[PDB]
Amino acid sequence: NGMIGEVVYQRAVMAVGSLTINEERSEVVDFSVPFVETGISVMVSRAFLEPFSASVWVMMFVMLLIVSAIAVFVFEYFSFTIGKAIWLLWGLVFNNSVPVQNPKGTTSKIMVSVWAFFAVIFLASYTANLAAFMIQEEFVDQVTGLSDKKFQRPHDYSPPFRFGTVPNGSTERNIRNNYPYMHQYMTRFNQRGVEDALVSLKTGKLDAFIYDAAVLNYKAGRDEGCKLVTIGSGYIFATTGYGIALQKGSPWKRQIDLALLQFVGDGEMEELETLWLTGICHNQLDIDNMAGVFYMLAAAMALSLITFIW
Amino acid sequence: SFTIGKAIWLLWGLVFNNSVPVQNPKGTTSKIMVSVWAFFAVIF
Amino acid sequence: GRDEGCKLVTIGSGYIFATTGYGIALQKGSPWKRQIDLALLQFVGDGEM
Amino acid sequence: NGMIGEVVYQRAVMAVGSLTINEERSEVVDFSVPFVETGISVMVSRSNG
Amino acid sequence: GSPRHTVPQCCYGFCIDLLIKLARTMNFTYEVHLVADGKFGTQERVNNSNKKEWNGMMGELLSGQADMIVAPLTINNERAQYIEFSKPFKYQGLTILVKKEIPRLDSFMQPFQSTLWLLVGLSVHVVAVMLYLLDRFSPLTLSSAMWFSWGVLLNSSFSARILGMVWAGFAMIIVASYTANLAAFLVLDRPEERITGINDPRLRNPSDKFIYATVKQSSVDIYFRRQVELSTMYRHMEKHNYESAAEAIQAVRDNKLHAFIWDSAVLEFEASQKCDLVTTGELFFRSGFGIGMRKDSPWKQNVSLSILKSHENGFMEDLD
Amino acid sequence: IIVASYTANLAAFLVLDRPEERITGINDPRLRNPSDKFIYATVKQSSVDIYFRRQVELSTMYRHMEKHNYESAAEAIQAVRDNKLHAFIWDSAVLEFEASQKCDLVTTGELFFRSGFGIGMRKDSPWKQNVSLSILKSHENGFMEDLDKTWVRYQELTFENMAGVFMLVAGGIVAGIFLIFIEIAYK
Numbered sequence: 001n002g003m004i005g006e007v008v009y010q011r012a013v014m015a016v017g018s019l020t021i022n023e024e025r026s027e028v029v030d031f032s033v034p035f036v037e038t039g040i041s042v043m044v045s046r047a048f049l050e051p052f053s054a055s056v057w058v059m060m061f062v063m064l065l066i067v068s069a070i071a072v073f074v075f076e077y078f079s080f081t082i083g084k085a086i087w088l089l090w091g092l093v094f095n096n097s098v099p100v101q102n103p104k105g106t107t108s109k110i111m112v113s114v115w116a117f118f119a120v121i122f123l124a125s126y127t128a129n130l131a132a133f134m135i136q137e138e139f140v141d142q143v144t145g146l147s148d149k150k151f152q153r154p155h156d157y158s159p160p161f162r163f164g165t166v167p168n169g170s171t172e173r174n175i176r177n178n179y180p181y182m183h184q185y186m187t188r189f190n191q192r193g194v195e196d197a198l199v200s201l202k203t204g205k206l207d208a209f210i211y212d213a214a215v216l217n218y219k220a221g222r223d224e225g226c227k228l229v230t231i232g233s234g235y236i237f238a239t240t241g242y243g244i245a246l247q248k249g250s251p252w253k254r255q256i257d258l259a260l261l262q263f264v265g266d267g268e269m270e271e272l273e274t275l276w277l278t279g280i281c282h283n284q285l286d287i288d289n290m291a292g293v294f295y296m297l298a299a300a301m302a303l304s305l306i307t308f309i310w
Numbered sequence: 311s312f313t314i315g316k317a318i319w320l321l322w323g324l325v326f327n328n329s330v331p332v333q334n335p336k337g338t339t340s341k342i343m344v345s346v347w348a349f350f351a352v353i354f
Numbered sequence: 355g356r357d358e359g360c361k362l363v364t365i366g367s368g369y370i371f372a373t374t375g376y377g378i379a380l381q382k383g384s385p386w387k388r389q390i391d392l393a394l395l396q397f398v399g400d401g402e403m
Numbered sequence: 404n405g406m407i408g409e410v411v412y413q414r415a416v417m418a419v420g421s422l423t424i425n426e427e428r429s430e431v432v433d434f435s436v437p438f439v440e441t442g443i444s445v446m447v448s449r450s451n452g
Numbered sequence: 453g454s455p456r457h458t459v460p461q462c463c464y465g466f467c468i469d470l471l472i473k474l475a476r477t478m479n480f481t482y483e484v485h486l487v488a489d490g491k492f493g494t495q496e497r498v499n500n501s502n503k504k505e506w507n508g509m510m511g512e513l514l515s516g517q518a519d520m521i522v523a524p525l526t527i528n529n530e531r532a533q534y535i536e537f538s539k540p541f542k543y544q545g546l547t548i549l550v551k552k553e554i555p556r557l558d559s560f561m562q563p564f565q566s567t568l569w570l571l572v573g574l575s576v577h578v579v580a581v582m583l584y585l586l587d588r589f590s591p592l593t594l595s596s597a598m599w600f601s602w603g604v605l606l607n608s609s610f611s612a613r614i615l616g617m618v619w620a621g622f623a624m625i626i627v628a629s630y631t632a633n634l635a636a637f638l639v640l641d642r643p644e645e646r647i648t649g650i651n652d653p654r655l656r657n658p659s660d661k662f663i664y665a666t667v668k669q670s671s672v673d674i675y676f677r678r679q680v681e682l683s684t685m686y687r688h689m690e691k692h693n694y695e696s697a698a699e700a701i702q703a704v705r706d707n708k709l710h711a712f713i714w715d716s717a718v719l720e721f722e723a724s725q726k727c728d729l730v731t732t733g734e735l736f737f738r739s740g741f742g743i744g745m746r747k748d749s750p751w752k753q754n755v756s757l758s759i760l761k762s763h764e765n766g767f768m769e770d771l772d
Numbered sequence: 773i774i775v776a777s778y779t780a781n782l783a784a785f786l787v788l789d790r791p792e793e794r795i796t797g798i799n800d801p802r803l804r805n806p807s808d809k810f811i812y813a814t815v816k817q818s819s820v821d822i823y824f825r826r827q828v829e830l831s832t833m834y835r836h837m838e839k840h841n842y843e844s845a846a847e848a849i850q851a852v853r854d855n856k857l858h859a860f861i862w863d864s865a866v867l868e869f870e871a872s873q874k875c876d877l878v879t880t881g882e883l884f885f886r887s888g889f890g891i892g893m894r895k896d897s898p899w900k901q902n903v904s905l906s907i908l909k910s911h912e913n914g915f916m917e918d919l920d921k922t923w924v925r926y927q928e929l930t931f932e933n934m935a936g937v938f939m940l941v942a943g944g945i946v947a948g949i950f951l952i953f954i955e956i957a958y959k
């Protein structure tokens with residue numbers, strides 16, 4: 001039926017209109033060369049201790065032990081700096097209005113001055129590192145794998161997702177030639193069409209939608225707020241092209257193929273892709289950071305209870 | 311009985327958090343508004 | 355725009371300067387002048403210039 | 404001399420190349436319509452700051 | 453607008469003083485008047501005989517009702533095919549005026565979400581309670597423990613020093629992260645708020661948030677009518693053909709518009725006038741504006757020589 | 773004021789912008805007008821030179837790269853390894869694998885001429901049509917998926933400004949303890 005019903009049954013010469021290419025379509029007629037890189041994709045709706053202070057952490061603790069041992073040696077050589085220098089010295093890191101003692105030793109005050117200047121400079125470097133972390137752009141993304149355990153059963157996790165395609169399409173045949181069980185899950189979660197699934201993704205009445213990648217890129221460059229984001233850039237997908245189907249035995253085929261090769265290799269196809277695509281869509285407090293600090297704080301309450309019971 | 315006229319200094323010295331700590335009374339007066347001014351310092 | 359170093363930006367964009375243009379000097383009495391001017395307005399008035 | 408010596412003395416026809424426009428050059432020949440906005444400027448060393 | 457009200461008033465400004473200098477140059481008289489309509493002039497089909505004619509300034513000049521159009525004449529190929537021109541006195545391009553001027557609390561507590569304030573308040577209350585409980589089970593006392601918990605947090609215990617040092621380091625790293633991300637937000641607070649010239653696919657098929665218009669019967673409309681990729685934009689512009697540019701300024705000031713196509717230096721002077729106007733950056737169609745002239749006439753040579761005499765000296769800088 | 777200016781200064785050294793320190797634009801006339809340090813090369817008698825010869829504004833790059841024609845791409849890898857090259861037109865995923873090898877090898881963002889790579893074939897043949905059908909049959913499934921998982925997909929801060937600061941503070945401590953010895957022995 002359709003353009004296959006017209007061209008193969010000798011009622012149409014060639015299909016200049018675009019169409020996806022698979023095995024039986026290449027069996028019934030003869031396509032042209034791929035002139036554009038149009039794969040498939042799936043449209044969705046859409047700490048600071050270990051990656052930052054790991055090797056500096058050890059040397060700063062070594063410097064803390066050295067400065068504390070020097071302070072203990074000055075306090076025992078020359079008013080609670082016998083073994084309680086850890087709390088005082090790591091309060092000198094921050095200086096959050098902690099009245100501790102008046103150091104009568106001149107060496108202790110010189111170490112306070114040098115450690116205060118050092119505290120200012122690595123505080124400045126830590127703020128610079130927070131700005132440097134702010135420089136790159138990050139967002140929350142799920143797994144990109146086509147063999148996901150979510151795809152086996154959405155009861156594996158607490159939200160059950162939903163996904164459909166357009167009916168009677170070549171994408172459905174690509175699914176059924178790869179995973180007929182995926183077609184069985186999609187059959188329960190069917191939908192109507194392109195714009196219907198578009199409104200369902202805008203309003204949140206759909207989780208995922210399998211479609212061609214480049215058309216979704218053209219629609220996501222003009223997306224309201226750039227919320228609708230594709231999955232990857234065609235890595236675990238088809239990553240195919242578009243051709244022009246001609247009848248089996250057409251003498252125009254070589255001339256059309258050489259004309260397309262002339263269209264590509266002079267920037268004229270690049271001019272058309274500049275005219276007919278979009279690239280504006282390029283590629284609030286953090287939540288996980290104070291959560292991990294709360295885990296470390298629960299460990300701190302555990303250690304404080306251990307030091308309190310003994 | 312010594313910070314009658316120096317209370318302007320008592321609000322004016324902790325702006326740059328390196329002043330002399332003044333003995334504050336236990337009459338629930340000083341440390342609340344001192345923490346308020348310190349939080350305002352954290353803002354500005 | 356082709357400078358080695360890219361450290362040469364002049365004063366403004368012709369604000370306290372002459373700000374003139376370039377044309378084609380034809381002899382006094384050339385009949386081609388109107389056709390050349392229409393060709394220049396064709397070349398400029400479409401983005402080709 | 405140059406292109407003015409070639410065009411005004413009719414050894415040439417017209418100056419397709421670039422040419423600055425002023426009073427007596429517009430007296431001796433007829434310039435076309437302008438096609439490019441070419442003023443003047445001053446280039447200096449303009450080191451780092 | 454007006455049934456019949458044509459009164460003698462005072463006219464002055466830039467091109468008026470240009471005409472004063474031109475009358476200073478050559479010995480002639482004149483009569484300053486205005487065009488009847490408020491339109492530039494297009495070669496639109498008149499209702500009879502199926503003929504494209506002119507109107508406005510060219511409609512009065514070609515009919516003999518005008519002698520010399522003193523105006524920033526948009527010099528194009530079509531109008532030169534009918535009349536002769538002069539030297540372009542103005543060198544001016546095209547740009548897009550938008551509205552990116554929205555006033556600002558900077559999200560401190562009332563626009564800012566209330567996680568950290570209530571969280572730190574309840575957390576320092578928990579800290580004060582457990583410090584007082586450790587003060588009870590020692591291995592104005594309650595006010596002392598609470599004010600100790602405040603003074604650790606204020607930023608200006610044998611078995612309780614660990615709790616205090618963790619709370620102090622936590623408070624400083626949280627206020628340092630808050631300082632860092634507020635500063636990094638208000639430095640990098642420049643989103644995509646422009647058109648980036650004619651190369652904008654969103655203006656090829658606009659929406660309700662993209663309301664752009666133009667002057668009714670303008671030469672920019674003719675320049676767009678020449679190019680094939682602009683008439684679709686005319687499908688958004690034919691419903692919003694505005695009479696004067698001041699009506700466009702009033703519409704874009706009351707947020708009834710979002711983009712306007714206009715010459716650059718006029719919009720820069722209006723941005724100097726009205727501080728709530730910022731144009732785009734990409735300059736395109738660097739054109740020349742001259743004086744509307746008739747055909748072959750003896751008042752074409754010395755007039756153009758006077759224009760060149762005005763260009764060569766610092767009188768252009770005086771007009772600046 | 774001093775420590776705030778110093779903090780914002782240290783936050784200002786690492787402000788990462790768009791890349792204009794090296795030439796990234798393909799339409800830059802600095803490509804059309806190279807210099808002594810604008811060493812760009814290509815493979816000797818490659819398809820890139822044919823794509824350049826198809827256009828007409830490419831004579832300057834041809835006369836520059838006629839002394840820069842490379843036999844193998846490994847020669848270009850060794851030349852950019854010893855910092856002799858400055859630009860090289862090459863395929864995407866091979867340079868992605870090279871960036872997975874070495875971190876200093878960094879690509880640019882302008883992906884141009886997104887072409888298609890097939891198999892060099894003879895004329896019309898019984899080993900042409902079924903072979904192209906087998907190419908389509910290998911493309912419809914994930915036969916190249918695990919092949920991308922082998923080498924294409926699989927690759928192989930506080931740390932920068934800490935070493936010399938640690939050494940300078942350690943030297944300051946070594947000098948200061950001896951100054952403390954001087955101050956104690958003076959009393």
Ligand SMILES: *[C@@H]1O[C@H](CO)[C@@H](O)[C@H](O)[C@H]1NC(C)=O
Nearest residue numbers: 001166167168169190191192
């Ligand atoms: C197309 O799909 C619909 C269900 O959406 C089905 O009812 C119909 O039979 C299909 N068309 C054909 C000819 O198979």
Ligand SMILES: *[C@@H]1O[C@H](CO)[C@@H](O)[C@H](O)[C@H]1NC(C)=O
Nearest residue numbers: 453454455456457458459460
């Ligand atoms: C112009 O028109 C307005 C509105 O009719 C009227 O109030 C005003 O008096 C008129 N002015 C002149 C110049 O007649």
Ligand SMILES: *[C@@H]1O[C@H](CO)[C@@H](O)[C@H](O)[C@H]1NC(C)=O
Nearest residue numbers: 475476477478479480481482
């Ligand atoms: C020139 O100007 C004078 C006024 O200064 C005027 O009376 C006269 O009619 C004008 N015409 C000429 C060329 O004499």
Ligand SMILES: *[C@@H]1O[C@H](CO)[C@@H](O)[C@H](O)[C@H]1NC(C)=O
Nearest residue numbers: 495496497498499500505507
């Ligand atoms: C033609 O008639 C219309 C009214 O039908 C009116 O605009 C005017 O009289 C004429 N001009 C054009 C071309 O609209």
Ligand SMILES: *[C@@H]1O[C@H](CO)[C@@H](O)[C@H](O)[C@H]1NC(C)=O
Nearest residue numbers: 477478479750753754755757
């Ligand atoms: C230019 O100068 C005078 C005054 O404008 C005018 O009478 C004369 O005809 C003009 N020169 C020539 C040679 O036409």
Ligand SMILES: *[C@@H]1O[C@H](CO)[C@@H](O)[C@H](O)[C@H]1NC(C)=O
Nearest residue numbers: 897898899900901902903905
């Ligand atoms: C291709 O395969 C078919 C059998 O499937 C057979 O005609 C022959 O082996 C090949 N024919 C052509 C056209 O290459």
